Amino acid sequence: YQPVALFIGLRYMRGRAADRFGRFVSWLSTIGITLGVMALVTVLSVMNGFERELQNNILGLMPQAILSSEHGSLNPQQLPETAVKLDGVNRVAPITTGDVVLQSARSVAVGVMLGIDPAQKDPLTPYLVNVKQTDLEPGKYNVILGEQLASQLGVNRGDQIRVMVPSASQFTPMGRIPSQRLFNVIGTFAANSEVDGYEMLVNIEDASRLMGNITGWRLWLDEPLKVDSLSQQKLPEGSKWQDWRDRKGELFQAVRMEKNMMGLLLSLIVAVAAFNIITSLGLMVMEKQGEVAILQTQGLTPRQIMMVFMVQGASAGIIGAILGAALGALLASQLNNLMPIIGVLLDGAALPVAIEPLQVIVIALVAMAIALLSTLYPSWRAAATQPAEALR
């Protein structure tokens, strides 16, 4: 009854048997697809939840994007904050970065010196354990050691430590010694992470490393994961890009490597579900030998008869990826909200999930693509056949 001749030859081929088992074996290619997309969304949402937990803890603090100059020291009078009009950033603040060593009254350690401004805001400010950000006075040379850094050194509130810059030093002829400076603590900070093991907050106005200027600008990135596209952009002259790949480059690369390994591990369900359409449509041509050969006698081109079996291999992929993404977004969202009998972790302290809106679309179009390439080969055997060399 439909005016389109391509869709009227396959709408009555979906359900023909009156028994419930006869229609269950015809939709088996649909169930194999929607169980692979659901296994690809719900599992990868747990891996994205562990990735977002490592993003607010390791990439929340320890700032990623600095803009070092050609000689390292960047003059703020020549390169102001209104000249760095790069995309992705949202706030420009002066900062410095330099690896130093520690020398307390008990033992020695290593750390990363970070000079923050006492007037500007910082994400480490709510994590300060009874420390004020305005306590960093220029000329007093104060220091804010971490929780795990002061624990291994035995430094309490009111102890004098000794820092030393080994990279930038004045090469005096009376023995090659690095520049050292005595620092006094004012308090520690706790963040329940690995940041407070080596980070130390000093004043921005200090000449411990060199000079009076800064080394770069603190750039808060909106998406600190895709720093490869933000490093090859239009960069101004007299500046260089230094991302987080110098310190934590091999850490987050292992998280992306495990995501592709589990993503390839769960993609085998779609490949067998694509193999199910070749077996299902491979037997339909052998039994409908009197229906395909009678269509060519009614004045039908072989290009149009190929689309009759092409949609039948594509209708299971369209409604299979939509139902797989709909059920995949409800199981991951209601994983720990409904009932915790889905499997309790060793701690069970607010297990997070993450449903990316761009990850659902890229998964479902692959499931609609592998099912399309597994349809042209059964469709070619039903369109390139000879009507004179048929069964009758």
């Binding site: 088992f21 599992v43 020695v108 350690a109 290593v110 490597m257 490949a271 067998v272 060793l346």
Partner: protein, 409 residues
């Protein structure tokens, strides 16, 4: 010896009707793909447990006793107290140090421990993973230090040159003194292929007594336990027999995640791979719906020759099992040659992709091991046949309630 349910059923599978030969290839490799990645998956996880017993457990002591900062005036009597405790094999003292190995324009944090070279080999195998043969003459006077492999490529040093490290200045008065950069030479390098290569160093116990300007005093007591799983009850028994409540811990809070997250894979990919065979069992359902239709005249002969409904049900159950046994056994024979020869396979893909997989800077080890066990092969064969029996039972039920009178008999 074969019965009627098996011995007279393989002749029915020999059917040719055009492109049916393509169906026998896709349905074979469709169910053999999930078994071939399950044999090499469980054998690889057995290799990570095999390398954990010798490269992690045999090099790290289980006992970790941090006492009060009073430097162990009763350390001689404490060594014999934990030795008579059942469950602890041996014991050896150790002194915790913190230094920075530097050779110029590079800084690396190192963890130096002072152990006796004539006593460490009784409880753990430290010289069993050393590349160089210079593991002897470790006494006082020479002032040598052996380092790992992660600090060998970063510092760009060799075996024989003198390096400069940092020592903690011991002083009872709370003040600040000048640091001491003692010049020591490298007397060899070790290789553990893991995280204990760039943050591990060991010195003899006779050389550590002159650095803190003390006599006979240690800063920790290490031991070794026979039952490595009981890292909670056995540690509390040794802490009370020596002294009062001190900073006592074990390896279950530090290396507990290394023994973990490999049994999670034993539950994640097991439920993820039975869904692969579950989709692959749908090809068995599709080939038995056709098998009733084309051989519908052959069922009408059996209904007139005196066959019950239970005999016709048992025909199509073993008919789908013979098509599943050819695909399941074809995945086992292609899984042994990959599991036993995985080392030329993983190294071949890394030569054409550049970045080698499983880098030892953040992972467990560098290479990908494989320990094939014959117990896990039997667990898949029952699993691959139970999924094929549930998929072939429902087409076998439809082939028995058919009417032989409506068909031409």
């Amino acid at each position: 010896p074969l019965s009627l349910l098996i011995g007279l059923r393989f002749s029915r599978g020999r059917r040719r009707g055009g492109m049916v030969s393509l169906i026998s290839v896709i349905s074979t490799i469709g169910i053999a793909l999930g078994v071939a990645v399950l044999i090499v998956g469980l054998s690889a996880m057995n290799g990570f447990e095999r390398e954990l017993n010798n490269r992690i457990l045999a090099v790290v002591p289980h006992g970790e006793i941090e006492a009060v900062d009073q430097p162990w005036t009763n350390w001689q009597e404490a060594l014999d107290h934990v030795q008579k405790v059942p469950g602890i094999a041996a014991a050896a003292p150790y002194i915790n140090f913190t230094g920075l190995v530097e050779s110029g324009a590079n800084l690396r944090a190192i963890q130096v421990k002072g152990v006796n070279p004539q006593q460490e080999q009784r409880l753990s195998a430290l010289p069993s993973f050393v590349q160089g043969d210079a593991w002897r003459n470790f006494k006082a006077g020479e002032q040598q230090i052996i380092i790992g492999k992660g600090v060998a490529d970063a510092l760009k040093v060799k075996q024989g040159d003198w390096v400069s490290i940092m020592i903690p200045n011991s002083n009872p008065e709370h003040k600040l003194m000048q640091p001491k950069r003692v010049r020591l030479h490298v007397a060899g390098i070790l290789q553990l292929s893991g995280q204990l290569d760039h943050s591990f160093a060991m010195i003899p116990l006779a050389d550590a007594q002159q650095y803190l300007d003390m006599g006979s005093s240690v800063s920790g007591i290490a031991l070794k336990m026979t039952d490595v799983f009981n890292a909670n009850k056995l540690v509390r028994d040794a802490g009370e027999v020596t002294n009062s409540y001190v900073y006592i811990k074990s390896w279950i809070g530090t290396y507990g995640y290394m023994y973990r997250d490999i049994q999670m894979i034993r539950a994640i990919m097991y439920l993820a791979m039975v869904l692969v065979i579950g989709v692959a069992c749908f090809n068995i359902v599709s080939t038995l719906v056709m098998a009733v239709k084309d051989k519908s005249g052959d069922i009408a002969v059996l209904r007139t020759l005196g066959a019950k409904d239970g005999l016709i049900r048992a025909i199509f159950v073993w008919y789908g099992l013979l098509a599943g046994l050819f695909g399941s056994l074809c995945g086992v024979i292609i899984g042994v040659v990959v599991s036993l020869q995985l080392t030329p396979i993983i190294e071949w893909i890394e030569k054409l992709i550049g970045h080698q997989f499983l880098s030892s800077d953040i992972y467990f080890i560098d290479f990908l091991p494989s320990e094939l066990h014959w117990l896990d092969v039997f667990y898949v064969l029952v699993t691959a046949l139970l999924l094929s029996l549930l998929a072939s039972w429902y087409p076998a039920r439809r082939a028995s309630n058919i009417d032989p009178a409506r068909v031409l008999s």
